[PDB]
Amino acid sequence: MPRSKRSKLVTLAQTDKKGRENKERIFDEVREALDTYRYVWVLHLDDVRTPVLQEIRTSWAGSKLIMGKRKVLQKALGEKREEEYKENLYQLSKLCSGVTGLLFTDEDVNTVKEYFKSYVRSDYSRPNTKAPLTFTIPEGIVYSRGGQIPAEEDVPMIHSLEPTMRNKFEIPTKIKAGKITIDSPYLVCTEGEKLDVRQALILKQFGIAASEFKVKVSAYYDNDSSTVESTNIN
């Protein structure tokens, strides 16, 4: 297959791939941190906002946490008994179902669990989850916030996003003289309904982040006791 193969759309940018060097650095960091701190915790961060993660890091900067590829992190912790860096460390790795998010610290379990339980932040719909609340787009002139606000002050939607609504959000709409308008109100969400990608994108565009994401933890590891307790918070 010399010719007619798939072409490329490479674009010039001031950034390059880190390559295997970053993976090796993460491996070494995980290995060092395993013995650096008495307590090791696993945090699931499949979908988390960058500012929230930065704020969490700053709150307990001393309680440094190392993140990376799930498979790479599992290899660093040791998936098998003969590969574990520490005795019975594979139990923590096995319970790591989500994306870690390996936290190393010294404070007792009570402090960590209280911090996890007492913290919660708003988040997008994140489809495959129950609808946080019902929402229907009002008719007439539309607004950037979806109309669930004092629309008398809200700025009308920009014309540039009308094609996005037609194609991306898949919401039938028409174009009017000055502002985007719809002939009839179109429902997009309802209580207890499993949302879809289109609904999530629409909610994110309207800024209705009625959902609330919270840190998820599955277990932790004790350096001395060499035992893993399947602590869970919901």
């Binding site: 072409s7 010039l12 014309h159 009308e162 094609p163 194609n167 174009i175």
Partner: protein, 230 residues
């Protein structure tokens, strides 16, 4: 009339539904269309298409190289900065222009049997002292259209060409009778008024004339090129 409003109308009707989709489909089909045309565009068109493609590829390569180099990271006075910038002749053993049709024969008289006339088909410089003699004496004829007074002059220094009057011709090889005739005959050495450059030899005696050799062939070109023998 009615300045750029068309943008306003586009903003009030917003990118007709099929326009974006059609544009995207055309852009996707652009590669296939170019590949197909690489086989189409037959004689007198495929050559131009290939030349354009080669130029585009060279430009893309040079732009990629510049980006890659950038991603890695003759003193002049304060008033000249930020401003635009073994005695063998350069061309020995010139082509041996033979004594041939170049001395074109023009038939004279109503009955063309006593021409006796020869015409020089080579560029020649004479100057003010031409003074065409009576027609009966025109044994050799140098046409006016083929006479040039200013020849291009250059030197491997600053690459500046300036048209200068031709002063005279001193030595034309290959039967210098041509020298006596004043013909250019590329390979000749001619004097040129170099007063424009104003180069001054040792002793403060400003020079304004130097001998230069014709580089280009004025017979096959409408311009005369020479290089200063400095």
């Amino acid at each position: 009339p009615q300045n750029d409003y068309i943008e306003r109308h586009i903003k009030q009707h917003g990118k007709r539904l099929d326009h974006e989709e059609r544009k995207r489909k055309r852009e996707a089909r652009e590669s296939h269309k170019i590949s197909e045309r690489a086989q189409k565009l037959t004689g007198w068109k495929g050559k131009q298409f290939a030349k354009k493609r080669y130029a585009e590829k060279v430009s893309m390569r040079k732009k990629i190289k510049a980006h890659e180099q950038s991603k890695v990271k003759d003193a002049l006075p304060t008033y000249l900065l930020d401003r635009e910038q073994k005695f063998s002749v350069p061309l020995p053993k010139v082509r041996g222009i033979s004594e041939e049709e170049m001395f074109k024969v023009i038939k004279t008289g109503k009955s063309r049997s006593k021409s006796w006339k020869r015409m020089i088909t080579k560029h020649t410089f004479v100057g003010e002292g031409f003074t065409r003699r009576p027609v009966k004496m025109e044994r050799i004829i140098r046409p006016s259209a083929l006479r040039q007074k200013k020849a291009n002059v250059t030197h491997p220094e600053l690459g500046v060409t300036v048209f200068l009057p031709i002063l005279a011709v001193k030595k034309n090889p290959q039967s210098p009778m041509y020298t006596q005739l004043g013909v250019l005959t590329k390979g000749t050495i001619i004097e040129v008024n170099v007063s424009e450059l104003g180069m001054v030899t040792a002793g403060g005696k400003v020079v304004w004339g130097k001998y230069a050799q014709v580089t280009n062939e004025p017979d096959r070109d409408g311009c005369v090129n020479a290089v200063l023998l400095v």
